[PDB]
Amino acid sequence: LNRVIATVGTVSISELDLDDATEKYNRLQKHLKHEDYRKSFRTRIIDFLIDRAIVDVVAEEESIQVNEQRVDSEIEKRMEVMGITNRKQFEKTMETSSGMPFELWVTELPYQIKKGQLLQLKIAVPPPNEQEIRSWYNQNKDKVGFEIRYRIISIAPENDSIQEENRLYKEVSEIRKSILADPSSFALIAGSPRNDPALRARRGMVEWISSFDLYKYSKITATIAAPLPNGGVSEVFRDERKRYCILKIEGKRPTPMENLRGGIQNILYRDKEEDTFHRWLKESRAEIPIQIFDEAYRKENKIPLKEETFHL
């Protein structure tokens, strides 16, 4: 009862092949940003399988072979980018992002490899142009973000004592009262010996940075800076290095394109491949011989029969 649903080129899609795929397609339905939900699950899955068949078929013709060894090679080439060293930790990393068991996720790699190699060979994805970059910037200002310029005072405690904590809390709180009283002071006190040696030189000032890049250096400092307006003095807080701090936003500006250039290019190019390739599959379905045998699909997707005499 494992009947043939369809044939895509040399590939044959069995009713079994469908049932096997039934799990993967469901966990992939989240990532598959094209399928028209008006169509039945039965249609959508067959359609899924046909697209996979096309890739397999075309890769054969172009001598793109993906063997057991090449799969392992790719996993390790993916680690040698992500940073990851243990094979066991990578298995969990992927299960998070996919929401799929590793033994199932690994069966995507052939498709992914073949797809990447086909795009490298057949398909054309022209790098995005300056007018396209500027238009993304100009029409995605919410997604650009903001850059900040601020001044910080960071005083470390000598001893691990609670008494020292109470002193420094009061010390820094006094500096804060003084700063609101006379803002001009902040510059002087930042150059003053109480502040960290690194900040004394650069007048306590931190030049143009994203709250995100800052969040990388210090999650605390950023979460504290992010909500404050221009000239906002932060409340007295502690560093991730247990230092007693105070910061003041000296400037805010929308992050200049120049910095986000690469990032915008990457967004644009990936959306270019994801469409060029989606069209190429549509296009390929017209070139590669496909035959549907399954009556359900035939009926639903409006496929004619020869000499199906018109009613008149």
Side-chain angles (χ1 to χ4, degrees), residues 241 243-273 275:
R241 297 160 60 173
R243 300 182 287 178
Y244 277 83
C245 325
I246 269 294
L247 75 91
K248 194 220 187 184
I249 280 106
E250 287 277 313
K252 244 163 169 198
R253 80 180 177 182
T255 173
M257 196 188 308
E258 298 50 47
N259 307 291
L260 297 170
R261 212 177 306 281
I264 301 166
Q265 268 176 336
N266 280 270
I267 308 317
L268 297 176
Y269 184 88
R270 288 196 280 248
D271 294 13
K272 211 174 209 155
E273 302 181 326
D275 284 36

Side-chain angles (χ1 to χ4, degrees), residues 17-26 28-29 34 37 39-67 70-71 73-76 78-79 82-85 87 89-91 93-95 97-102 104-130 132-159 161-168 171-176 178-187 189-201 203-215 217-241:
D17 287 313
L18 190 151
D19 320 320
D20 306 327
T22 305
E23 245 289 281
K24 196 191 248 176
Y25 178 69
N26 294 332
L28 279 171
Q29 263 180 308
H34 283 278
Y37 276 82
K39 286 123 121 209
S40 76
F41 171 80
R42 177 160 201 80
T43 286
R44 304 194 315 274
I45 198 127
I46 290 159
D47 276 345
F48 167 73
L49 292 168
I50 308 200
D51 299 321
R52 295 285 159 121
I54 292 145
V55 188
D56 294 337
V57 166
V58 181
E60 238 153 28
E61 310 173 348
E62 305 315 322
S63 305
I64 297 145
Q65 289 140 306
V66 168
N67 87 296
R70 202 189 183 151
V71 187
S73 318
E74 176 67 28
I75 303 154
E76 277 152 315
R78 277 179 169 223
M79 288 168 180
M82 279 192 170
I84 293 150
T85 185
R87 267 259 179 165
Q89 60 160 327
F90 195 83
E91 292 195 30
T93 314
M94 290 317 198
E95 275 194 77
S97 303
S98 67
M100 180 179 275
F102 191 84
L104 186 65
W105 179 88
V106 72
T107 56
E108 281 282 276
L109 293 144
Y111 164 75
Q112 319 239 317
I113 308 152
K114 286 178 224 155
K115 169 175 165 185
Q117 285 260 283
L118 281 164
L119 277 148
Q120 158 150 112
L121 173 63
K122 279 197 165 176
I123 314 129
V125 54
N129 65 59
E130 219 60 51
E132 282 165 332
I133 294 176
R134 289 149 189 259
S135 293
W136 186 93
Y137 191 91
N138 273 77
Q139 70 199 122
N140 299 299
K141 277 121 159 191
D142 56 328
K143 297 183 280 317
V144 316
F146 63 88
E147 263 181 343
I148 59 155
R149 225 182 49 102
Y150 69 103
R151 213 187 268 109
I152 196 175
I153 294 164
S154 294
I155 304 149
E158 292 118 33
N159 45 114
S161 93
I162 356 300
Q163 306 92 279
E164 181 75 323
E165 291 194 13
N166 285 296
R167 180 192 66 83
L168 263 187
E171 225 264 80
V172 190
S173 307
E174 284 308 333
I175 319 173
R176 193 208 202 273
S178 326
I179 289 331
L180 311 196
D182 178 43
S184 335
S185 323
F186 208 109
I189 312 169
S192 148
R194 269 157 310 161
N195 200 9
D196 190 278
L199 304 159
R200 270 204 296 272
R203 68 155 174 166
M205 276 284 208
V206 186
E207 281 294 308
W208 295 119
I209 176 163
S210 177
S211 325
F212 195 84
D213 307 307
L214 175 54
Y215 189 90
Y217 167 66
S218 170
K219 272 173 267 180
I220 301 158
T221 315
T223 51
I224 282 287
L228 354 151
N230 205 309
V233 166
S234 91
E235 295 288 356
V236 181
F237 72 95
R238 283 186 97 163
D239 215 299
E240 341 217 286
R241 297 160 60 173

